[PDB]
């Protein structure tokens, strides 16, 4: 719902938050959204998101994440021009807490996203 945690990955950091396709991220850049938690928030990630997402993000500012960055996102839009299709029939009901943004109460606010330490994989 509100869920709104910070990353950074490819130079660039954006948005995860849990919503129909679970985590959703953002590019900084331009603070664009997974049009999957938009489309596939509403249609499912299936041969239809395939295409409508393609054919909806593929034309609207679709970024596909891959190699690690930006792969809680996969089909980011233009966050002016994907609220403006999710608000439609996309999510803009379930992302009530998205758009509502986690403010600090002014309590202590935890840190971004969990804090993990890379391992080392030797070959």
Do not use: C
Not at 66 to 91: D, H, R
């Amino acid at each position: 719902s509100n869920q709104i945690y910070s990353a950074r990955y490819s130079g660039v950091d954006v948005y995860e938050f849990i919503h129909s396709t679970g985590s959703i991220m953002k590019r900084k850049k331009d603070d664009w959204v997974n049009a999957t938690h938009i489309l596939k928030a509403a249609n499912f990630a299936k041969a239809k998101r395939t295409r409508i997402l393609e054919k909806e993000v593929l034309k609207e500012t679709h970024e596909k994440v891959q190699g690690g960055f930006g792969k809680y996102q996969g089909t980011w839009v233009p966050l002016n021009i994907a609220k403006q299709l999710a608000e439609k029939f996309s999510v803009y009901d379930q992302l009530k807490p998205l758009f509502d943004f986690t403010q600090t109460d002014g309590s202590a606010s935890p840190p971004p996203a969990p804090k993990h330490h890379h391992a080392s994989k030797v070959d």
